Design a protein that fits this description.
The structure is cut from a larger assembly and holds two copies of chain A, one copy of chain B (about 70 residues), three copies of chain C and one copy of chain G (about 1350 residues). With about 150 residues, chain A is an all-alpha fold. Helix content of chain A is about 60%, strand content about 0%. Chain B has about 70 residues and is mainly α. Chain B is elongated and about 60 Å long. Classes of the chains: A mainly alpha (about 150), B mainly alpha (about 70), C mainly alpha (about 50), G alpha+beta (about 1350). Strand 1 of chain A pairs parallel with strand 1 of chain D, so a sheet runs across the interface. The complex binds magnesium ion and zinc ion (ZN). Chain B: Pfam families: zf-dskA_traR (PF01258).
Chain lengths: ~150, ~70, ~50, ~150, ~50, ~50, ~1350
Amino acid sequence: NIGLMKAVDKFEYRRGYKFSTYATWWIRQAITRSIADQARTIRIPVHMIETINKLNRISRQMLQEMGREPTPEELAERMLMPEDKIRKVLKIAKEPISMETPIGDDEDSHLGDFIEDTTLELPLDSATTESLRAATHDVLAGLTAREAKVLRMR
Amino acid sequence: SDEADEAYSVTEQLTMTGINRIRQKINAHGIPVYLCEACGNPIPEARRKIFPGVTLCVECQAYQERQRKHYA
Amino acid sequence: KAIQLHPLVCAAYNADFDGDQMAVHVPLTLEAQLEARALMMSTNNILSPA
Amino acid sequence: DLRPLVPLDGGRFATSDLNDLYRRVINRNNRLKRLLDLAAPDIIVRNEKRMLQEAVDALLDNGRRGRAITGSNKRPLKSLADMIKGKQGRFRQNLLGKRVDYSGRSVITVGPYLRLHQCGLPKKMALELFKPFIYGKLELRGLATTIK
Amino acid sequence: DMGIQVMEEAPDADDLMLAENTADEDAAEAAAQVLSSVESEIGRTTDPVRM
Amino acid sequence: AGMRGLMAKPDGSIIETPITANFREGLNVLQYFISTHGARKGLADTALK
Amino acid sequence: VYSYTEKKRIRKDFGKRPQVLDVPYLLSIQLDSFQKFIEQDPEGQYGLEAAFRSVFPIQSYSGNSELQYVSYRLGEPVFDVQECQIRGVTYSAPLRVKLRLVIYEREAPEGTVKDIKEQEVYMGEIPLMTDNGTFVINGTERVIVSQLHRSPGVFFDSDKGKTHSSGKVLYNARIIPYRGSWLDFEFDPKDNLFVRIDRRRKLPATIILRALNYTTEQILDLFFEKVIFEIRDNKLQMELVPERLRGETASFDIEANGKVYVEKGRRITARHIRQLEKDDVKLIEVPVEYIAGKVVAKDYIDESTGELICAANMELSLDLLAKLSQSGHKRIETLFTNDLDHGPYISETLRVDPTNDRLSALVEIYRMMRPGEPPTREAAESLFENLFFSEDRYDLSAVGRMKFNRSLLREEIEGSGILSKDDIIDVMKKLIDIRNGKGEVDDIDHLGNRRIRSVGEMAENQFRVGLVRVERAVKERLSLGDLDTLMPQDMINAKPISAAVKEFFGSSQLSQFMDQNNPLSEITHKRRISALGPGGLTRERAGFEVRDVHPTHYGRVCPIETPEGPNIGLINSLSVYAQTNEYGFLETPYRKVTDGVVTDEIHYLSAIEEGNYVIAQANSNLDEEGHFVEDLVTCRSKGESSLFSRDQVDYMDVSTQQVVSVGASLIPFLEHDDANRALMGANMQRQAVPTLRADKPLVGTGMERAVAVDSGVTAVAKRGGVVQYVDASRIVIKVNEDEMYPGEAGIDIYNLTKYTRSNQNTCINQMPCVSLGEPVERGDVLADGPSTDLGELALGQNMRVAFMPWNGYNFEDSILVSERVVQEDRFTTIHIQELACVSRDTKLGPEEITADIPNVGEAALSKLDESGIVYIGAEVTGGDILVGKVTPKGETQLTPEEKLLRAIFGEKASDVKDSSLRVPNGVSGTVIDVQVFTRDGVEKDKRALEIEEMQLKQAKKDLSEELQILEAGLFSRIRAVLVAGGVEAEKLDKLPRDRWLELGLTDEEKQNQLEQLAEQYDELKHEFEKKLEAKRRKITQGDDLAPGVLKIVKVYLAVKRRIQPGDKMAGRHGNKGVISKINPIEDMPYDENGTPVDIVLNPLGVPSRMNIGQILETHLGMAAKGIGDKINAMLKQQQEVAKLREFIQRAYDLGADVRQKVDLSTFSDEEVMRLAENLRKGMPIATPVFDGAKEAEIKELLKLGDLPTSGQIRLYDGRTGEQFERPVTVGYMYMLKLNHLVDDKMHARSTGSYSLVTQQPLGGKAQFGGQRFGEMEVWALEAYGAAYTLQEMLTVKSDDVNGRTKMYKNIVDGNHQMEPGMPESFNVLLKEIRSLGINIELEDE
Ligand SMILES: [Mg+2]
Ligand SMILES: [Zn+2]
């Protein structure tokens, strides 16, 4: 709809066009821009989507030319990329998994219920920290006032 | 207990209730009838001897069992 | 590595020993220890609640 | 952080679904604002407002609307009226049935040599259940100056 | 959402979740009303692509 | 020791061919098989219970 | 007449009945199905050819851009089986199709083809089947189970009881086609007959008949007989057939013959009709009173006015009698109705039937199919022509037509593809004849409605779906169809179809991990009939109707094998002798009985055919002629069984086993066990982990050898001969000259499969059972596998059991194993693990596998070599470092006084992070094998170079040992040629063998022969040079790893778990037990001779559970070891072979008739000595399942020993040394060891990891987190007064992410408080409930 509105706004009969096939281009271009920009969950840019669909076209061509399937070392010569951008591209261009995916191998579970937390500090660590505070405090008390003050401040 | 022993008790219940249902159906007690309770025909005394207290003939009995096969 | 349970209590748990798995918790605090001794100890529940 | 986008190993991310639904609703809101700036014909703005209505109604309950909007799976994507409900919502599944530190389990066994007020128990389950108690006692009897 | 809580395929159903029911008063009178109104007046459109 | 009754098929209707044998003796093929009906009904109920 | 490879030990075999049809190849379902799936098949039937033919040829959008088919080929795999388990590929095979894109010209109806571009185009990889019906999807050997769904056809279901609540039942009839629209029939409570097309609204069932060009007269004369009424000079005479008026009240006196044959009022008895048949009546006149309610069928209108007198299917009255009377109507045709037999169904449905002729009915059907569509002549006509009657939208598959014709008792096996007039008519007549009384419904279980898919058929269907979704794209690309530019492959995309087939073989409720822990378990998993999965009925929709056993499972599904628990009966096991029908049904064998002879010709009967015979039963005595020894013998006819005459039986059962499966036929004495206890017995015998020194069954059931061989574990000799080179790793048979092919003779070589992980982490091993210089008949077992002894399946080991309580260390169901069992390592079983340690590619940097690690001294890194992979042979324990690895970790970001520490000591906290793979706590094994993988962009490290070197030297040595044999065979052919025309025998070998090619010879055809053979030799040289080259290039080239990984390093630990309290042992009869005290030898009991009984079970477990089988087994095993010990003494006091001959020959003859007689006067002395040595452990006795050892035979086989015939011994206690009163039982029971080991179930978590969205304990390793302290436990803790325990049960210990660490600090400080706070889950609940439009708050006061 948006694209057709832009097409209407940028039409003239003074080149003898047929408005149907004229606006077909604008519609397809606007929908392509949208399907690129706001489709992937984590948004990848336009040139990146063009590279990804190039890789998919060449993957299909090779996967019935070479018979079995192509390797990145072969894509980096059908495509002419630096042999490492292909690794990064085919790393990036995949969707995310739905964290409510049913990992039905249990009573009734979900993949979300199995992703542990990494940043939490162990209670062992927290107890050690508090013990070390106490120890170093008594140590620094085992100095003079000027000593302890300078050694706290620096 | 075990997952077999529970099943044993349930199967014993099932067969017991079945057998008691089919012992209850047989009459073996009552007063002689001398004639059908549906059509009025006579019940021959041999059949009455086989089942003391047969309220029906063999014809009406078969007919009633046969309607009851369709469970209505 | 087997939790050697008592025998008499198995009727209460309804637990033969065909591989059944009991779980042990632990009472952390001090009120919870006095409750796991004065209310939930094994020799204070021998009369069935029903 | 109640609808994370965790980095799984391999670049693959394993996000919740509310990110998807909010992404849809934010898209449709922005698109409606963009339509209003142009002042499109009323069929356009009407269909857009209906789309936003369905988007929000799928955000809240994803049901009562007639047909859920399933994600890239074929499985209908859960929503805010659905992270509270059910035998897996927070009420029944994480406000009553919660995992519990300081627990364990094993195969039970016979053990007739016991008075009835003492269950047997392995040395190893004991030394794994009572690590904090052990640590306290060991820093008490000076068998280890520090907890490490 | 009405009194009926099936919607079924199979008739029954035994001791497995047996003799279930929820009263749900004040929902039946509105649901049956919605039925009698949807039938009598006209057939309403559903979804928005079809709109 | 004695004979073992009349296996009841899972319909609820009791079969009329009793098991004139017992466990100290054998059970030929028909008799064991007829036992299978009630045995599996007991299982299929103490699985739902 | 035994082979030299069975004389190793010869099982004493009871069991009378002379078998006739030896066990089939146990895996015929799997292999046969997948062979029919993938094979070039010049006929449209089952196979991929069926798939391609149906989708193809195909055509463009009407403009002749056509795309036809030629043929297909299955290219060889790139990776064989073993490399494809080692690496992790799917053992696939490239698919290849010869499509053809042909295009006719614009303005060309059928003119000559203008373009035909041919080419072979790839699509998918259909994963090939291993030898044993086990696919290899991703390294893990997987097994597709046969499904079990409704045969598309006719059914007459009942739906009895519940609906309508008045106890009345209904009779729906469904005509389900393979593809197309259903067609249901059914009665209402009101008895009107109601038709319905696909599950849409009901209709008056006569509407379809009117739409079939039937009007009312011929409807009534289809669904009714006739009773005439006449007026012959007086008052409404009647025709009367004697059968019509049975058991009814009369509204008239039965007058005829000027006589009262019958008096009115009575219900017409049978003797009524007998006497009337002695009368020959054709007529009895009755009053109008009985015609006053009839139903006149044919149409009556006036001969003078042509006016409508009485319509079709109206009930006359006397006025109506006269109305049709006075204008000449002598015949009155009236329906012969009744309440019992010939009920009013079609007449009354005509009452309901609003529409009259073909037009109205067609209009009604047309509007019922699609709402609001206006009715139209050709509209309705085409709609009703395409509902059920056109090739396009409706096709009863030939399976369907067979069921349909057969179920109506129609003679022809095959016929049309679609419905027709008499089809629907016979369905309705059969429904009516059901409800009248003469007929029966077909309940769901009956195996004439359970047609068995299997691997081939399901794979064909999924590849079918692939072809349809691809031909969408084909016709799409041919929308713009170009004539000479797009070859027949740019259109087609492999990843759709390949993705579909991979989705099936790896993502399904059928393609599931095989149980590889026990050969019995493998071969009772490949053979399975499942009702679940796609296309079948799930649990809740279905449902009890199919959890059950129906009287036609006899020989087609094991009655006593099905996994109890969640889904009983849904996982039936295919029976022993049973196969799959042609159309797909199950079919068992029977012996064709002639007039009175039991002829040997086995004769497979399906399930729909079994009732229509009268089958004998295999427990029938037959006297050396096929004559039944009596005049009556028990048989089963139609479910029911009952004594039948001698000359009535048409089939006798093959052999006594066929009712049971292979799982439950390896149980000795199955005839003495309740079906439940036998079910648990079979269901636990499938689980027994393969022990270390697998012994044998001291009592077995004959089938054990067939289940050992026909699985894949043992190594059956492909050809027989002498064993040239037995080694611990291989065997090198020299095939006899009887079987040695003329061209390049050579020999066989069997590379055994040593220690390798199985799917269940047990030790699938193979040992060699034949010693050097031995003969081997064809079809012999050369290499035992796991749990196979000399080719006989030993799951567990037999050990001296004794039934007596003994202090209650076996209280409920427990076992009490004595330390003599644990010393010998006779349950010391072995478990092998695959610990992985990947090396991923983080944005901060790549993880290295470096050995130099921070904060682990040389105390733990003593084991690691120079590259961070443990040595092959370390004895690592719980906690060591197997793969020292470090990941980059920037942003030190230290703290206060820790920083003062750093200053005081100068300790630099590196950016390096230890994340090495350390052994999971609790295991203590020997690292037996390390494998390394590497993306081909990383410089391989030092140890990976060692491993390439080692594997490459291995492959070189192997391929050299191969090429030697091969070129030796070629030498043999050249030599066999030289004997023709230039033979020079003993001066051709003295010189070097290579100096034969360069030998001259006459210029005949034979010299050109040497020419060709020299070419063959040199080509073999060059060719296996290059084949070694290809092996070296499979090794040396990199690997294709997951995206974002650099190098994975697998370390296989081999734990040796012994035995201990917890490890569930359990006999074969379903007597479970958790071993609960490993006693000293002293404390055990001991019979009066010294021998201490090992296991001490509980006698209180037998009388409560009718499984007296184990007690008979104990006595028989006791007697068998009696024979064994007598042989032991006779051999160890070593006597002479004559003594052993007389005694063993006594042990094998033994009394009652058998099918076993051995005749040891044929063995040589140096065989009977071998036989005795293999019997000294105990004489292995057999007992076929339902032909067991009758107790008198056991008492006599105990007398042959010297045990007490009672079976019981006085046991002296081992502590107090005083006789246990009342002699106890002893004997040898065969006891498995189920793999519910204790050190897999044990678990304890003090403070592990935590989840991410809800901060709950979530740890992994052995669910390394708390126990699910669910809801009912909370009701328990509320029931007590316990409130603080509950609070710290679900606030501190579990969720509140400040309360828990304050709790931990307080615990370490020795101050047991708990400052609880508020859970984290409720906090998330506030944030969610508030994310909606709902202000949730907390009042504060
Ligand atoms: Mg139990
Ligand atoms: Zn009567």
